[PDB]
Design a protein around this nucleic acid. Structure first.
Lengths: 61, 100, 56, 141, 145, 143, 63, 64, 206
RNA sequence: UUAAUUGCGAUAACGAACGAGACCUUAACCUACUAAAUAGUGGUGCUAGCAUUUGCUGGUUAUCCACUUCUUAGAGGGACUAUCGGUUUCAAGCCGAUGGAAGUUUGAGGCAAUAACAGGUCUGUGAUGCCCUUAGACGUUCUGGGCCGCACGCGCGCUACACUGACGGAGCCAGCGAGUCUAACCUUGGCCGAGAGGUCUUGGUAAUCUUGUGAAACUCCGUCGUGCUGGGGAUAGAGCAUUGUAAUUAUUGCUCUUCAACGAGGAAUUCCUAGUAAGCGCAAGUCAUCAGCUUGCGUUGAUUACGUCCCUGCCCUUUGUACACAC
């Protein structure tokens, strides 16, 4: 059951529409970058939301 | 003089705050000291049947909470213990004085 | 005198003593809750109520 | 400052403290030689981290291991990796890199658990059964 | 090297204390068949006799078996203590006794009649064929009659 | 060299010690060695029953070595075992205190052990020497 | 006990009422133009070894 | 152990390519105790050699 | 064979296992041949195991079960009957005990012919049953490669302890005669006359 | 497709809300920080041994020094399914191999949508509507029995039905948790008794003392033998002790004897996809005493899938209904 939910999906598409050259194809460099511009009040939640957008940079490549 | 302080509580934030305040006052002047030894917290669990009746499927639960104790010892004559007598006590955490 | 584990649970049931007794006695007084603070020698009990002119 | 390194190791609950130092190369557990291990048939298996690379380079390193926790096979599993992990630590302080890589490759090629701790750990048992997934015997009529 | 070839002294059957005991087995486990002697009791009489414990029942000189009879007849004067007799502190004289195959059945039956004639609780339960230990016969112990 | 009881096999240590305390029996022989069950959890006495006080004396001598303080409650807890208490499942029970006390008194009679500070028993000076010396000669027995 | 052999390339699906029987496309090495399905009681997947008793007689979906 | 079987044992035991306590019991009509003494006597006497004497099974072969 | 010792007493008959012709700790491991093409890549002999006691992470995934050596897998199939569930060191001792019992009767390098003792064990074909309901119409199918290694290793032990119930002979001496029995196609083993009855419906259900 | 209206897609949806999810805790890693004789490691001094020729094994808080690697939690880092190749408008998503502590939501629990049962409860309350009793009271208290009882039928469980065994020895490893004050707990040690057990003292309000809970199952030595036998302890008898004002229909423990069925059990039925089952023991619960029960903990540790809707049920769905406190 690795399928993501709505809130991560809708939030994920909010970054790349203006953060293309900042969402680097490496997870480690942007796993904490999202926190700087997306105010997330949970250490666990901020990981998969960064994970999903990182996942799309792989396919969008 | 072997005055030793004890801090016992359940919630963690309040005991962390007072210990940091205590070590900060200990950091003032010189007061060659030992750091806060961290006693290993014992979870106080009791198993109880959820239902007050006997009818129904077997359903148990665990009612538990944590106790964290940290002790700090001071080493010098009565000069320090005339100003540390001020009580920086929050609800929850409790303090006690032990010498020798 | 008493083990800290036994001392703390005894504090808890003693804490439960005020909650029901304040609720049962000062119900009309708009009782909300009790904050019990422990301190060497003197100790204070904080009560919460709406009609504070009546609780005094 | 005698040349010495320290390592550890867990299999199920055993904590094998591998106190490594420099000497004539005497290897013991709890102060006792490795000719006395416990089961009399894993004796060849506890020799594994030593023989896989040979005893040629074991003449200048001696390890103290003290173990506690779990069953007899659990400690025996603890010594093998603790002295193996201590061996990497010794190669991480004194001896050259080219020698180190070959022994580490030989360790992992045979099996992976000599340097990787076992992640399996008995999870808490549950109400409604003797174990976690086991359940009471239920009957109809 | 401990092997002894057979000479002809071995006998298949043995005849002790008006009971039948089989041979071809260890003497320590030979006396246990007679009524009133158990595993531990057979161990002590054999040990006190000093008769080379590792010996078969068939291979035994007639120098030892009757001695086993006389040592077990009155063990208490022979240093086997009071806590090794089944009928310790008998109810008729207070002295220690050890019943044998001709005595365990008579004394138990006599003790049954002793408790029978006094009409106490255990006797009537024994008379009815019911358990006297106070157990539960609601489900257990049903195929008795 | 540097041989000791730690470097000799446990089965080797008892068998070598069994020979020594049976070849020399100056220490003593109690009166009830042939009637002891060695525990309440056992069911039958040991079948050896000829010596069997030297075997126990060797093991406690080994146990005293790498341990520091051992009281009477330590041996019976270790020496005990499971007993088929009827149809009920097995349960661990303590061993016989009297035999543990008597064998402990035997070790004090020769002088290999003595009363230790803070309770328990320790290793006497002469006891440690001999326990090492007989540990030295048993290694060359198999050599 | 005669002898014949083949082997599997790729898995398709299951059969049987209980879903235990599995039939999977197989192939026999020599004269590589040989291809029929065959049911196997146990588990198979890509690049396994098929084994049998008769030469060529296939079956189909077990109802 | 009897006498008329003593000669049989000595002349027939160097003929098993495998010797063991269970093998002796099955094909010699010999009990467990009489098999134990026979195997321990033979191993001490000579010819057959104790390649592996272990717990409850004395694994053993024929030596010529 | 680089006979070097360290300051602990190490009897040099233990350093000869792998700094030599790398054979199993007391038996030659290089001459191990498969006598059937059915169980290639499914018996994991090569690599060796010093004792079949790798308590590894081998059973979580679907098809990582056969990647441990058959010797290791052969151990597992012996601890059952409830009384001996678990207690695998009870088995590893006896399999290490009984493997010399093949190396005397025309020695043949036992591990070589351990695999030769699987060619006729696994069922050549078992007959799975159609849904139906009634006379139990079983139509014969050939078997998967795995079920001639995976449950055939259960056919050496499915009832192999029926010859160990209230009888004198021990466990370790049994498999020796049955080992060559599966290698020669005998008439008195278990796994090879219950292969034949497992396919008594041999050529009738097609 | 996913355990999941969990997601892509659609068409008149555009969007949103609860639940799931998300959140927390436990078990996993940290040789990167804080530290710790109420946890330890190494060395320096005193003391004992072995061979002494080099070293090894130990003990020692007022003999000190350096550190947290092992033992602790505090803030944190860390896996997100990352890389490639296969399947897919080439979208969700799935599979195999390439780092590791971990690629079945890392594993498992806690919380856990609307709505219903006329499901259990008046034997849980001092909250209970109503009825009844209300003073030789159905209120309280005191003595003795009952809740254990058998012609019988069923459900949870323990010993079992021999050698992968039984018995007697040696080595023989932990975790969760509990423990006294104006009451008398956890009991160390010494002594006595075979044992249960008894006496005198020691420490502990507890990482310090019980406790390294040195536990059993485990391995090496021996006796036994295929024998309802050395398996098996149901059936009782006698004696010796503990708990309690009191134990008789033995509370319980210990010693001796008596040594029956049971010989792996016929329909059906139960839990199980990894430390899981199963085996074993331990701690806690009821306790003045008593586990064959429950909860938790640890130990040894299999076979074996990696799937399906014909049964056992459910979910969405279609359709019919003279029903709407609704079969």
């Amino acid at each position: 059951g690795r399928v993501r939910t709505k809130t991560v999906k809708r939030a994920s598409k909010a970054l790349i529409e203006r953060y293309y050259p900042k969402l680097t194809l490496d997870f480690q460099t942007n796993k904490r970058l999202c926190d700087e511009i997306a105010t997330i009040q949970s250490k666990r939640l901020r990981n998969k939301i960064a994970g999903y957008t990182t996942h799309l940079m792989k396919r969008i490549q | 003089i072997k005055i030793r302080i004890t801090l016992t509580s359940t919630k963690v934030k309040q005991l962390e705050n007072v210990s940091s305040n205590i070590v900060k006052n200990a950091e003032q002047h010189n007061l060659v000291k030992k750091g806060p030894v961290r006693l290993p917290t014992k979870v106080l669990k009791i198993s109880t049947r959820k239902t007050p009746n006997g009818e129904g499927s077997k359903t148990w639960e665990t009612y538990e909470m944590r106790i964290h104790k940290r002790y700090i010892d001071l080493e010098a004559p009565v000069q320090i213990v005339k100003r540390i007598t001020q009580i920086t006590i929050e609800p929850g955490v409790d303090v006690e004085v032990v010498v020798a | 005198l008493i083990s800290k584990k036994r001392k703390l649970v005894a504090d808890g049931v003693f804490y439960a003593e005020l909650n029901e007794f304040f609720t049962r006695e000062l119900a009309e007084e708009g009782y909300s809750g009790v904050e019990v603070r422990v301190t060497p020698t003197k100790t204070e009990v904080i009560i919460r109520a709406t009609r504070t002119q009546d609780v005094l | 400052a005698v040349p010495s390194v320290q390592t550890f190791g867990k299999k199920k609950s055993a904590t094998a403290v591998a106190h490594v130092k420099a000497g004539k190369g005497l290897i013991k557990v709890n102060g006792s030689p490795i000719t006395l291990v416990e089961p009399e048939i894993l004796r060849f298996k506890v020799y594994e981290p030593l023989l896989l690379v040979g005893l040629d380079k074991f003449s200048n390193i001696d390890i103290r291991v003290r173990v506690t926790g779990g069953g007899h096979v659990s400690q025996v599993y603890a010594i093998r990796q603790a002295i193996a992990k201590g061996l990497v630590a010794y190669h991480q302080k004194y001896v050259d890199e080219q020698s180190k890589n070959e022994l580490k490759k030989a360790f992992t090629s045979y099996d992976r658990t000599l340097l990787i701790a076992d992640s399996r750990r008995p999870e808490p048992k549950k109400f409604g059964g003797k174990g976690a997934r086991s359940r009471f015997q239920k009957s109809y009529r | 090297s401990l092997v002894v070839q057979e000479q002809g002294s071995f006998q298949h059957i043995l005849r002790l204390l008006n009971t039948n005991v089989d041979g071809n087995i260890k003497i320590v486990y030979a006396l246990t068949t007679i009524k009133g002697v158990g595993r531990r009791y057979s161990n002590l009489v054999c040990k006190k006799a000093d008769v080379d414990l590792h010996k078969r029942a068939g291979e035994l000189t007639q120098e030892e078996l009757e001695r086993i009879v006389q040592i077990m007849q009155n063990p208490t004067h022979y240093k086997i203590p009071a806590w090794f007799l089944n009928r310790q502190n008998d109810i008729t004289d207070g002295k220690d006794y050890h019943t044998l195959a001709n005595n365990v059945e008579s004394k138990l039956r006599d003790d049954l009649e002793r408790l029978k004639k006094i009409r106490a609780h255990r006797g009537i339960r024994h008379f009815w064929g019911l358990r006297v230990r106070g157990q539960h016969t609601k489900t257990t112990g049903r195929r008795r009659a | 060299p540097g041989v000791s009881v730690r470097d000799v096999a446990a089965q080797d240590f008892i068998n070598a010690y069994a020979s020594f305390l049976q070849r020399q029996g100056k220490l003593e022989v109690p009166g009830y060695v042939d009637i002891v069950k060695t525990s309440s959890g056992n069911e039958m006495p040991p079948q050896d029953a000829e010596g069997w006080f030297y075997k126990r004396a060797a093991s406690v001598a080994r146990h005293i070595y790498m341990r520091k303080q051992v009281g009477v409650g330590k041996l019976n807890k270790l020496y005990g075992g499971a007993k088929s208490r009827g149809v009920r499942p097995y349960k661990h029970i303590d061993a016989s205190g009297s035999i543990n006390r008597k064998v402990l008194q035997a070790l004090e009679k020769i002088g290999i052990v003595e009363i230790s500070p803070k309770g328990g028993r320790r290793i006497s000076e002469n006891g440690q020497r001999d326990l090492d010396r007989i540990a030295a000669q048993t290694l060359e027995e198999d050599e | 006990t005669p002898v014949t052999l083949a082997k599997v390339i790729k898995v398709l699906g299951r059969t049987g009422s209980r879903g235990g029987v599995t039939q999977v496309r197989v192939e026999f090495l020599e004269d590589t133009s040989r291809t029929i399905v065959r049911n196997v009681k146990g588990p198979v997947r890509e690049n396994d070894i098929l084994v049998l008793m008769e030469s060529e007689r296939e079956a189909r979906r077990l109802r | 152990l009897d006498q008329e079987k003593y000669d049989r044992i000595l002349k027939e035991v160097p003929t098993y390519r495998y010797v063991s306590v269970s093998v002796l019991v099955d094909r010699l009509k010999i009990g467990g105790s009489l098999a134990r003494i026979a195997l321990r006597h033979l191993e001490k006497e000579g010819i057959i050699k104790p390649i592996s004497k272990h717990s409850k099974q004395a694994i053993y072969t024929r030596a010529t | 064979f680089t006979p070097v010792v360290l300051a602990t007493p190490i009897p040099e008959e233990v350093q000869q296992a792998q700094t030599e012709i790398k054979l199993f700790n007391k038996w030659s491991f290089e001459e191990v041949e498969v006598k059937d093409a059915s169980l290639v890549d499914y018996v994991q002999v090569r690599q060796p195991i010093f004792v079949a006691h790798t308590a590894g992470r081998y059973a979580n995934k679907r098809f990582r079960k056969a990647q441990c050596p058959i010797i290791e897998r052969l151990t597992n199939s012996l601890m059952m009957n409830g009384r001996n569930n678990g207690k695998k060191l009870k088995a590893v001792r006896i399999i290490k005990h009984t493997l010399d019992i093949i190396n005397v009767l025309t020695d043949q390098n036992p591990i070589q012919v351990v695999v030769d003792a699987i060619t006729n064990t696994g069922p050549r074909e078992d007959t799975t049953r159609v849904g139906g309901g009634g006379a139990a119409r079983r139509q014969a199918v050939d078997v998967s490669p795995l079920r001639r290694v995976n449950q055939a290793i259960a056919l050496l032990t499915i009832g192999a302890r029926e010859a160990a119930f209230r009888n004198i002979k021990t466990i370790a001496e049994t498999l020796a005669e049955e080992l060559i029995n599966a290698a020669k196609g005998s008439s008195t083993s278990y796994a090879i006359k219950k292969k034949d009855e497992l396919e008594r419906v041999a050529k009738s259900n097609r």
